[PDB]
Amino acid sequence: MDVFVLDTSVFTNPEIYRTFEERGAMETFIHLALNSRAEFYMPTSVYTEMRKIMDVGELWAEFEMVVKIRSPRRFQLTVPADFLYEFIEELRYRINKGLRIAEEHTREASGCEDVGKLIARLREKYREALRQGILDSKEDVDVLLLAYELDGVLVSADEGLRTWADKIGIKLIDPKNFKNILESLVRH
Amino acid sequence: MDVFVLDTSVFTNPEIYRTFEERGAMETFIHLALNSRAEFYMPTSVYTEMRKIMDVGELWAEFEMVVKIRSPRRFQLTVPADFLYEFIEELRYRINKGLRIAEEHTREASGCEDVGKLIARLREKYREALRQGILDSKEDVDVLLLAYELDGVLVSADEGLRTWADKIGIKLIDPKNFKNILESLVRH
Amino acid sequence: MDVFVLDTSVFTNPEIYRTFEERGAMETFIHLALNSRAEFYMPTSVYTEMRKIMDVGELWAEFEMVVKIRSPRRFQLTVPADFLYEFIEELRYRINKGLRIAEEHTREASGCEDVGKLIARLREKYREALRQGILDSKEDVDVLLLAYELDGVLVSADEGLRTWADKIGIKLIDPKNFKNILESLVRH
Amino acid sequence: MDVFVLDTSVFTNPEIYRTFEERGAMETFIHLALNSRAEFYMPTSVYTEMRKIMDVGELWAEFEMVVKIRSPRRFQLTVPADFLYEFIEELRYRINKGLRIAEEHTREASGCEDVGKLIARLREKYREALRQGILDSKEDVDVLLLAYELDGVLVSADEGLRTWADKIGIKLIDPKNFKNILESLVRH
Amino acid sequence: MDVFVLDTSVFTNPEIYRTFEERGAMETFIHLALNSRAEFYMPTSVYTEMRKIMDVGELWAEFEMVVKIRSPRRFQLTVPADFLYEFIEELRYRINKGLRIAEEHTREASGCEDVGKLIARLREKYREALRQGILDSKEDVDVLLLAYELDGVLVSADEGLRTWADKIGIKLIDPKNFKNILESLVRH
Amino acid sequence: MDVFVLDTSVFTNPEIYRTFEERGAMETFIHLALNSRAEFYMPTSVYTEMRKIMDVGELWAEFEMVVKIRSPRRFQLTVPADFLYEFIEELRYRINKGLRIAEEHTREASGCEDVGKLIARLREKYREALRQGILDSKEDVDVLLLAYELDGVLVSADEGLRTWADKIGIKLIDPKNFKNILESLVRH
Amino acid sequence: MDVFVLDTSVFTNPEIYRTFEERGAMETFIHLALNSRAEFYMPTSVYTEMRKIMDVGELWAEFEMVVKIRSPRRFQLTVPADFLYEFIEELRYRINKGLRIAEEHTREASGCEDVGKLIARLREKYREALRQGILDSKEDVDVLLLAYELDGVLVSADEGLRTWADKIGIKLIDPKNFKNILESLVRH
Amino acid sequence: MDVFVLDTSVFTNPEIYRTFEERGAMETFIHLALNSRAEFYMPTSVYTEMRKIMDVGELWAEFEMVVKIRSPRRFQLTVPADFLYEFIEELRYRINKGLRIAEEHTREASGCEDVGKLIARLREKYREALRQGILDSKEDVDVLLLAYELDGVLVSADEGLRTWADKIGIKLIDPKNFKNILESLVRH
Amino acid sequence: MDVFVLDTSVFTNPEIYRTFEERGAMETFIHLALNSRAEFYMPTSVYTEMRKIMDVGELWAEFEMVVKIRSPRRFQLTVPADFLYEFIEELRYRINKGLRIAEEHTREASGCEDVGKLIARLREKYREALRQGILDSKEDVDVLLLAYELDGVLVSADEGLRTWADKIGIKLIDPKNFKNILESLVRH
Amino acid sequence: MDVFVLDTSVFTNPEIYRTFEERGAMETFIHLALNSRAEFYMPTSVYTEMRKIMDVGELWAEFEMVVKIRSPRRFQLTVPADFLYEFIEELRYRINKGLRIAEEHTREASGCEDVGKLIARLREKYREALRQGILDSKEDVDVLLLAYELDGVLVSADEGLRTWADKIGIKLIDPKNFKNILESLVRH
């Protein structure tokens, strides 16, 4: 049957934390997953970032059971050139926007002595200027490449991952309906 | 014989402007190029950026004659996955460094009222933090892909292009000795 | 179901000796293994090194029953070139570090007459300088190649084996949770 | 015609320095090379190590002309597993021999106060114990991989490179007769 | 379950004759074999050599029942070239050693008139020089090829068969523990 | 055009020494070979045995020019099983014949005191009993495997190589007419 | 369980007629066969030849019950080429021998007037010269092909069928012990 | 272009001897063959039978040049079962006819004392009864198998080879028009 | 147990009508069939032709109970090409024979005025010329295909169905002994 | 490029005789065919029927050159069952229609004494009743099977071949435009 490529953004994001049976989310997900032989996958890099960020006690055993933890075998894969071209072309605009935001916040800091609030606002604006919208870290690229070779169904709540997975030719799924999808595949 | 993939950074950079017979550089380069049938190439994007930045009157005719202006045919090319992996892994560090520099300059701006000099310093430091060292714009990626399919000899003064062209497997040449190289190929 | 590639470092290392039901470890492992048809594997070279190092009386029969003892069929396998490149590039640094440690210990020996303690310290430092971190002997390479063709789940407590198995594309498992993993696969 | 894969050990080693027309060696080699269209090659890593070690003034131009400087394209190449198996199996013995030599020199240092001469002897013996006989650095592996994909004629004075190039299936040439070989190919 | 490839050297060799319930060995082996559906196999050539050498009255019926008697289907099998290379390379040394032994025994015969004892000693030494250690007859090659296609567990007391079966990639078993192995597989 | 796989038995055997223009044979062969682009080949092992046995001064340069010196790449080749079966089946008979000859010569030595002549006769008879007729050393197997992958025309005066090359499917040529064949291919 | 491929030469040959409970043989065979679900088979051609040669009244019903009567499905089967090569190579010798026997009997007939006895002797000798030893008619080939696809246990008293079934890879059984084999499979 | 599989029956049969330019036939055939790169082939067995039967002085050199002499590689080929079925079914009838002819000639020999003429008549009739019409010797089977793997154009004057080559799926050519066919392929 | 593929020609043909307990035949057949779980089958087309030709009152209920009425699933079945080739090759001869019979009967009609008797004779002869001997209608092809996928035992009194079912590889049964066969399978 | 499967109905039918350059048709077709490497094919059976029906002097040589003459290899091909079902279902109707026509012509013959004209009319009507519309002879089936395995472009003027080739999945071409099609493929 279909093979799902998991991600970190499927059981740590608060909304998908809640839709998954409200620690309990992990075990309910595990029991649901073990049924109907829908093979899952998740790259090692994503695994280590997630475990570093979030930890559950002794429940990891069945998670290692069902969700396989590979690396994409990046030596036999090739990504089309236009993908890289578009990535870098968009990244240049993002960098310029971030520089402009940094400039305007420097002037605002020179204006008034409210340094802490302005630093917090800079954290908000710079991250939205650069990290929001495209592939930011290496975990996302690893998810793409792992899901690209196995012809798997990418599952993510990241809005910068979905568009770039759509450009490459990976079939996507609705992240908000993943729980119901898994349940209906398990039952019927 | 060997085929050279040109770039914008071969006859607009002041040092390579000077080593090329000191407008005169373009025509001397053209005459030298027309000899010995060393086919050149240069992507259209680089051509339009260069002509937008620099303009010479009516000399362009023989430049269109000798230096061919293609596009890489980005539909039949594939770049290895580890290249993209390393690119994005390094880019993340660059972004963090740029954010830290922006922070420290905001605090320095809050410290003293020397806004213009600090803005100039921010222009210097941010560009060195991000744009210096890797593929920044799309013209560089276009140069890589054009030089990658024709097995051409990349010619550039960009230090962020050379390393990434070395990773992919393109044969490079010394940019500082290009004029003498072309002359010795022409004569003997 | 999933197929596990065993190793010597799963039931001779003292910590994994203890977590395995505290000779008793072997038989408890055997009974647990015989259930649920999780096929195991272990190369012959590892087998002979382990039996040479450690011996149990007459219990080997069921071990031959369940844990299959192959050789990787090294004639139909190919390892990507970048793997070898990285291996040798790192090995050069290791060799230089070992030479420097040998030098400094020679000078310390010249300094004072405490030869036995310094020889013991040299044994500690040289092994950490070279053998620790990468593929040292041939048993580890055999484990990699056997686990690479069968798409098996490598199981090892060696920290120099895990990284190099991650580079090649083998799916790994947590060595500390292997007993609980096997139990939960057996029961449910 | 045949394509030769060059190396650093063809015009810096004193003996092959002498057999090559006794700076003069480089230019005589260059003139001989430019004739008869025997395409050469040399990896970038070897090029940078050689130029770092040895430098000639302004003669490099024709060297860039004739001797192409690539990288092996290590993403499309595969090395057979038995090669790696034998490499690591031999390396283990080398490491043990080096450790034993370090031990005996520590005891000799404890014996007498002749530290400088013994350090020099340790430099001689340790390098012979480890670096002599097999692929030591990454430049050699790069030479192998570049010569392996182009079906080129490896040319080296390294006795640890020749055996490992013979195991893989690369055709070799006599390094001592390279000059006469090139001359006779040029003339007739 | 696992499939065993039998041999002649499992119930005619005196030691394995004894460990098998001390004619009685054959029938005890047969009863043990009929249980638990561990499919056996044995090539026809081995069968005819064994029956020619050893004969049991009317017990053969159940032996034909349980131990299947095939031929390897040598038309669809391929043996790697390095196997043949190593076989012949070792055989050359064996032949030279046998010739030297023959020479020295000729001189000893010329020395003294003890012809019968020296002929007996020549029988002992020549057989050890050539037939001992490698694949001698065709029955052994037949056992290898039959066990190689079925992925069976080779069972033999021949020390020249085990190494060559290990080179090819056949999983081996302990010949001395075969009886206990079969019993424990039958019972539990 | 056709590609010839050379051997040691083409220009050291006295008869083919004579038919090749009567040191002079090597150079006449070389000049004839350089014409018409009939690519030759010869394995390294054969090369080292031949150079060890026979040496010519400074003529080797053009020999390295024309006759390529590879190794068979024994990792991607497979030899059919029936070939090995027949080889070993015949070898067993050869070994028994050699043992019988050794026996009868021992008795003859016991008979009379003519030890030197009988030792010489034993050298003659034993070599004819074993080494004559089949693949004896590893150089012959190397010639077979090199000629088997390139679909080359094996050229040898060895009567034990020709039959085994005929069994495998290699196209053979007449060794006595090789000189005239090469000449007529060169001229017309 | 095992599936037996029957033949005509299992219950019409007088010796196997006798060992089968001494018409009575057919019914005893049938009752024994119906037990233990050892599926049998027999080709239609063999069936029609046997029924044409031998007939039993009204007992055929249970024979149609137990012994299935197929045709080999000769459209999906392939026989290795070396089999045909050896068959025809041996057949040529047989034909020549038959011609020589015919010649010598013609001369003997010319010698003396004993025509009837010599004709009887010619019937004896010619049949032994050609039909004895190899596959003579089409029923035997049909038995081979039917037994080859089902991986069945060929059962025949024909000495020319057994060798050719051994060459192809069919597992054989002892024809003289078939009754006892079937009985022991039925009982235990 | 098309590849022709030669035979012995193309330049020894008197009629095709004559249509080929009337020793002269061989050399005219050779010159015609060397043109237009129509690759030929001929099995070794056919070659040795032909050279044993017919010999030409020193002309063989160019024959070895153009007409390649392989063996079919009978280990990777498979012949359909219905082919063998039909072959043996027809052979049985041939054998019976030969026996009947032998009988009637025995009676005729008994009748009258004309033994020599009747022996000659028996030679004529028996050969027509058996050898005429089907694959008689092994050279014909070798021609079939060699022509079957290369998809070559079988060329023969044997009327028992043509029908059996038509059954298997080999494309045939007119043997009487081979000379004109080769000429018209050479010229236009 | 075995599964029988019924036909129309098993309980409408007068002879098999009689051997089946002499309407009574249907019910006796039904009771016999319901025992021992010998699954039957019969295609729908045959069912409708039979019910159209022959009708029994209210007995059909148990016939629908026991004899399953499928269609062959003609979308997943494939018939070998040689079957179709032979069918059409024979059909051509049949058509020509029918035309010749029609001609001769036209001339006989022209001869004498006995039109009715000659028309009756034409009905007899034409049907024997074409419809007798091969697959005539579609019901027979349906029986073949249904019996071919289920590996069932075809049961028919049609002499043109039996030969073509024998060519394809379907196991047949004796139609005259079907009643006794079913009885003996039911009882014992 | 595309491969055409020829037929007899492409250069013997008068209309396609005329459109082909009006003996001259054959040679013009041959010259046109030899250009542009559009590989043709034609089965042997069609070839022998055509040559039997029509003969051209000495022009056959180039016809054997260009139009390959195979047999379909009917052992590796399978035709879908529904094809056979439809063929036989339609054939039954054709047979009944032919019988009715034969009847009515018998009555007309009884009516009047015009036997010759009525026999001619019967020849016209019966052939239209049966042979017209479907696959009549074996040559057509051979054309289908040869064109079915090579994925060739069937070329025929037979209206009963086109529909049945359309049912199976063979791509067809316009027979009336074949000459212009071949010309336009040759020129441009």
Numbering used by the authors:
A (entry chain B), B (entry chain A), C (entry chain D), D (entry chain C), E (entry chain F), F (entry chain E), ...: 1 to 22, 25 to 190
Q: Which sentences from the paper describe this structure?
A:
Ribonuclease P (RNase P) is an endoribonuclease that catalyzes the processing of the 5′ leader sequence of precursor tRNA (pre-tRNA). Recently, minimal PRORP (approximately 23 kDa) has been reported in bacteria and archaea. This type was initially found in the hyperthermophilic bacterium Aquifex aeolicus (gene name: aq880). Bioinformatics analysis has shown that homologs of Aq880 are widely present in some phyla of bacteria and archaea (termed HARPs for homologs of Aquifex RNase P).
After 3D classification, the particles converged into a single prominent class with a resolution of 3.62 Å. The cryo-EM structure revealed that Aq880 is a homododecamer. Each subunit has a typical PIN-like fold, which comprises a single α/β/α domain with a five-stranded parallel β-sheet (β1-β5) surrounded by nine α-helices (α1-α9). Notably, each subunit also possesses two prominent helices (α5 and α6) that are inserted into the nuclease domain. Hence, the region of the two helices was denoted as the “protruding helical” (PrH) domain. The two subunits formed a dimer mediated by the PrH domain, consisting of α5 and α6. The dodecameric assembly of Aq880 showed a left-handed one-turn superhelical structure with six dimers. Each dimer was aligned side-by-side with β-sheet interactions to form a hexamer of the dimer. In the present study, the structure of Aq880 revealed that these aspartate residues are localized in the nuclease domain near the PrH domain, representing the active site of Aq880. The structure of Aq880 revealed that the active site of Aq880 contains five acidic residues required for catalysis, which is analogous to the active site of eukaryotic PRORPs.
